[PDB]
Design a protein around this ligand. Sequence first.
Ligand SMILES: NC(=[NH2+])NCCC[C@H](N)C(=O)O
Ligand SMILES: NC(=[NH2+])NCCC[C@H](N)C(=O)O
Lengths: 225, 226
Amino acid sequence: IDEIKSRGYLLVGLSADFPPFEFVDENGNIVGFDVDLAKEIARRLGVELKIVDMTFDGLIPSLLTKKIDVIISGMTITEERKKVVAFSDPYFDAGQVIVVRKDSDFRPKTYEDLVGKTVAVQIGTTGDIEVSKYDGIKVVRFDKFTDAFLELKRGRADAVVLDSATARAFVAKNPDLVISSGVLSSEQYGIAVRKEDTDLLEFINSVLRELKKSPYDVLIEKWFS
Amino acid sequence: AIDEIKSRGYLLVGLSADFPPFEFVDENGNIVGFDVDLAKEIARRLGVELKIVDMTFDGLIPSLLTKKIDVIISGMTITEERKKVVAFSDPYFDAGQVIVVRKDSDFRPKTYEDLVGKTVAVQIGTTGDIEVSKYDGIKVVRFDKFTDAFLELKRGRADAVVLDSATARAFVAKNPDLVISSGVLSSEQYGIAVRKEDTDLLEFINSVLRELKKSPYDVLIEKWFS
Ligand SMILES: NC(=[NH2+])NCCC[C@H](N)C(=O)O
Ligand SMILES: NC(=[NH2+])NCCC[C@H](N)C(=O)O
């Protein structure tokens, strides 16, 4: 925390291929729900925000090597990831969906409906992790969701598997695609920090709980707590 | 109203400062509390100064009707009876009556019925007063200010005080010779009171409230999921 203030910025790592959380706008800028969160934390620390955009699967390792301060990148909290990083309070709820081409009679509803099919995923995601559990699925793994979608649009893969909110945003810009399934999991997004940075995490959870407090709730707290 | 409040340069808010923690007098002689803060937000959002008028609780409605004040923000319960003569904002707090007694007696009433044959102190014109007055066998003694209602209990001249849960807690908190002996005996909601004709002021107040109840998180969600 003191070190972040010396440096004069909070260094946040994300992969900007995940609207509406992180993504590239028409002018070339990284924007989204997570970008806003990150600005808030920075401002509340009295420092500037510095964003680095990288491969999603590389986020944890570069947190662990001190190349970034924190991960804000639509990252699902998982028992597995908890082995190596710490998570803030949850800040969003989503789950996996299956995206396919519109001009197709293909409409899978379950993971099992993908046995025999070629499914595109972002490497290291919970999408990746679930489909990897079924041996019948030909899993095709990409760094960026941008390429997973090109692969589906051209018909070389039969589906993309990815988080519901982001699936909706990609389908809105790609009328050739449709979400064929219901939500297949219960996932929550968290902000990741190194386990040793316990002050940073406390502060971040505290920014998170304030955000969810109306000025009414804050006023109640003032007089009743 | 609005244009008229703006023209004078100050909002006149009526309250009774004997009701912690919505409004009361602190260590340094100032009137403070949840309601005072809320009053400040209304004033600021109108672009005017804030003027608190302390007075007898039961005097507030007359005072609003004779135009000595623009609004009441004073822990006032929204009731059908009061709606005959004034208008209320949307509710902004939930509370109900409780019974407060002396810790070193042996009397622990749980319902209003338990107050039958006892001497009960209330603030005149409050929903507390209104409720105990329904019971023929309750001996009711009425006071302008809550502080005197409590002085009557602490002196052994009354067996109980009846008042709103939250304020009851705040009083007992600094009067360890007292205790709340009942659960919550009614279901009440506080509103801001304003003259029926001042519908522009009522509309505005409601949209300050609506908005004080809105979280940055929710705003952010609307921003990215429109
Ligand atoms: N490009 C991204 N920001 N992807 C993040 C979402 C992936 C999924 N929620 C996970 O934690 O694995
Ligand atoms: N001193 C006060 N501000 N009293 C207001 C509370 C009285 C009760 N809620 C009522 O509306 O009748």
